[PDB]
Design an enzyme around this catalytic site. Sequence first.
Site, mmCIF file in Angstrom:
data_model
loop_
_atom_site.group_PDB
_atom_site.id
_atom_site.type_symbol
_atom_site.label_atom_id
_atom_site.label_comp_id
_atom_site.label_asym_id
_atom_site.label_seq_id
_atom_site.Cartn_x
_atom_site.Cartn_y
_atom_site.Cartn_z
ATOM 1 N N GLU A 63 0.480 -1.120 0.540
ATOM 2 C CA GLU A 63 0.199 0.231 -0.343
ATOM 3 C C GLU A 63 0.692 1.329 0.158
ATOM 4 O OE1 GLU A 63 -3.317 0.106 -0.409
ATOM 5 O OE2 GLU A 63 -3.738 -2.372 0.130
ATOM 6 N N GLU A 85 -2.031 9.229 0.466
ATOM 7 C CA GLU A 85 -2.235 8.531 -1.131
ATOM 8 C C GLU A 85 -1.527 9.632 -1.944
ATOM 9 O OE1 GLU A 85 -6.169 7.966 -1.442
ATOM 10 O OE2 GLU A 85 -6.134 7.890 -3.724
#
Length: 238
Positions: A63, A85
């Site tokens: 991730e 992100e």
Amino acid sequence: MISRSMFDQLLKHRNDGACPAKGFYTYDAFIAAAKSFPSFGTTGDTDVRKREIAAFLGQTSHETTGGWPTAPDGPYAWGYCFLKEINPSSDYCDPSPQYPCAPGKQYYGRGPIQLSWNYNYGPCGEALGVDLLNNPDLVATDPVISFKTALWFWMTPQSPKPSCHDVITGRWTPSAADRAAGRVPGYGVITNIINGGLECGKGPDAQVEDRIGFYKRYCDILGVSYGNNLDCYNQRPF
């Protein structure tokens, strides 16, 4: 539990200047977080305890990976490179009377599991004792909280869907429907839990292969077998 030197060998490039998360993901923060979830890494025999840490670090490394195919030490040495992100497409706000979006705030992916959405920040914070619905940025400013959000995800079932913890430590026994859907214990069903809607039950996939690459490298360095059923390519999503 893995030592500092082992943690640093697995996550060898996270403190490179190349990585936005340089300096953030400290071993001390990982150990402090793990204290809030005392069965993490302490359940089962020696091989299972190591495998749980390899699987948790493998999935979270995917991730947060900064790897690329020709990278030094290979792509599976570049876990924990990112914190936030990259170019989030929205506020990740799905307004809810139970989880109301805080004004000015955004719930894009943060921390090792890239926790996303107000209705994930909400219950996670409640479980940790921290208001993440109203201060979601804590997941990218406080490394202990950051690791705690990922361990929260790992340790919390969405019954009948199991926790990743229960899968890797052998405490989950698939229901008959699970078995009919191909969902059997292993790293593959952990990928399914984490992002199976998009990654599982459709044949080979570059994201799944990345998750497995990290896990295999960590298992190799820790000296433990991978276990069976590593992919979810033939599993129905939950």
